[PDB]
Paper text:
AZE synthases catalyse the intramolecular 4-exo-tet cyclisation of S-adenosylmethionine (SAM), yielding a highly strained heterocycle. More recently, AZE synthases have been discovered in bacteria, namely AzeJ and VioH, which are involved in the biosynthesis of azetidomonamides and vioprolides, respectively. Interestingly, they show sequence similarity to the class I methyltransferases (MT1). Each subunit adopts a classic Rossmann fold, consisting of a 7-stranded β-sheet (β3↑, β2↑, β1↑, β4↑, β5↑, β10↓, β9↑) surrounded by helices α4-6, α8-9 and α11, a topology that is typical for MT1 enzymes.
Interestingly, the Fo-Fc electron density maps reveal that MTA and AZE are bound to the active site, suggesting that the substrate has been converted via an intramolecular nucleophilic nitrogen attack on the Cγ-carbon. Intriguingly, the structural superposition of AzeJ:SAH with AzeJ:MTA:AZE only shows marginal changes of the four-membered AZE-ring in the active site (rmsd = 0.3 Å, 221 Cα-atoms), except that the nitrogen and Cγ-atoms are moved by 1.5 Å towards each other. The amine group of AZE forms hydrogen bonds with the hydroxyl group of Tyr175 and the carbonyl oxygen of Phe134. Strong cation-π interactions with Phe134 indicate a protonated state of the nitrogen atom in the AZE product. Similarly as seen in AzeJ:SAH, the carboxylate of AZE forms three hydrogen bonds with Asn139, Y176 and S203. The latter two residues further coordinate with Arg172, which is additionally H-bonded to Thr193 and a water molecule.
Author numbering:
A (entry chain B): 13 to 245
B (entry chain A): 5 to 245
């Protein structure tokens, strides 16, 4: 199961500590941040729900839009950092956190605001062997999602190999596929990249319409609407 | 006549072989640096769209930390840095992302560029990212130079909160700044180092006062626990489309 590696004491910390990031990770994070900001404005989302938020990697986006924020992560320590930041930034009335599995939240959690955008950041979707389970759950509590994945360029694969080595992923193996590159590790680590075509196809199969699609050397970022989601203001 | 007079100007530390690399390597960043970088990225993106800037000039761009902003707006981009290795990385990325027609780089002192450089596009926004302004003991000459080739600037600085000062101390130690000293001041804490390293933070009030003294009007101001980011217009810059 996808949650196995991130239930390990230092699974999340090793993956999300900036100290383990090659410089070339930054353009993926920057594209995703800008797309999330623009999507929330255009689709009139009053709430941002960040799945796998760690220490609140998208909190600043909600802050600049005066939107509600919910961060969901399994990492208790990273959530305490986020809780402290929310308090010190005077955002207690607008921002909250939950320590839970993201699938528990998407299937069972209460609504955040009236029009919530769900962010799947920094290749979160790529950590799922069966991603349809997560994508199918989004429609219930959201009018929109932003999905950020690693691409399948030679440079993307090289950056990822360097990244996952620095994180100290054990039994790290590279598996070249048609529609992306899969990395596996011995402690249940799983991460795949996506071709633009494979990502679009997967999203269509789960009833998610692509409104915006951005690509750089390292990443694909898409803004999607559920089929049957209200498109109003 | 004098052995070291004129040798500790802002450019001195960044003319050292590994000066730029040590400061701009993402691995040396505490996690709490990321909200500063995210806020300035969002403000730069929004400013360019609203003010109809067709060009982004990133001063101290390193490997092209704001290239993605220009790319997502289909804007022209110029990256200015003293670091040849980081500019080479940026040139490769520009080629591979098919931006050779609209993105360029210069290896030069940012002050040489702002004083003597040709215009970029028709309406350029100048980005002073990641506390660049704070590396100057006397920043007024840089701010005074901005009006000539720009209709707008985004200025990103560390704030003077207890947390900001602690994050900066951790950050500068991870960069391996030698003889690191912390100088507490009301309007922004100053860190110094052995090889000419100088970095100050700014209070909201001090940053606003400095910008006004240099004829730069704040039109948007954002703050978090760690940082202040402002969008400024020069007094007399055209504000058309
Ligand atoms: C951005 S993907 C990595 C981050 O997402 C978090 N994460 C990954 N999978 C889950 C999950 N199933 N439930 C909650 N948080 C998760 C990890 O703890 C880490 O902070
Ligand atoms: C964001 S401040 C650090 C970055 O700005 C660059 N930088 C600092 N001062 C100058 C300067 N005077 N001219 C050019 N690049 C500079 C450094 O080389 C580094 O990439």
């Amino acid at each position: 199961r996808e949650s196995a590696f991130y239930e390990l004491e230092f699974g999340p910390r090793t993956i999300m500590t900036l100290a383990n990031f090659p410089d070339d990770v930054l353009p993926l994070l920057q594209m995703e941040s800008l797309m999330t900001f623009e999507a929330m404005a255009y689709l009139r989302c009053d709430a941002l729900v960040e799945l796998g938020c760690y220490d609140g990697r998208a909190l600043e986006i909600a802050r600049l839009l005066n939107a509600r924020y919910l961060g969901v992560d399994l990492d208790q320590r990273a959530i305490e950092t986020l809780r402290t930041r929310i308090e010190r930034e005077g955002m207690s009335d607008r921002a909250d956190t939950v320590v839970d599995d993201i699938l528990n939240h998407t299937r069972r959690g209460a609504s955040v605001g009236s029009r919530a955008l769900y962010l799947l950041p920094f290749n979160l979707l790529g950590n799922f062997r069966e991603p349809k389970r997560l994508l199918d759950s989004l429609a219930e509590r959201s009018v929109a999602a932003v999905v950020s994945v690693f691409g399948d360029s030679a440079e993307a694969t090289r950056v990822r190999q360097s990244y996952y080595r620095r994180c100290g992923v054990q039994g790290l193996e590279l598996h070249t596929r048609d529609d992306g590159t899969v990395f596996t590790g011995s402690d249940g680590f799983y991460s795949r990249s996506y071709s633009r075509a494979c990502l679009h196809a997967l999203l269509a199969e789960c009833g998610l319409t692509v409104v915006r699609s951005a690509s750089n050397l390292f990443a694909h970022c898409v803004t999607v609407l559920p089929e049957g989601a209200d498109q109003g203001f």
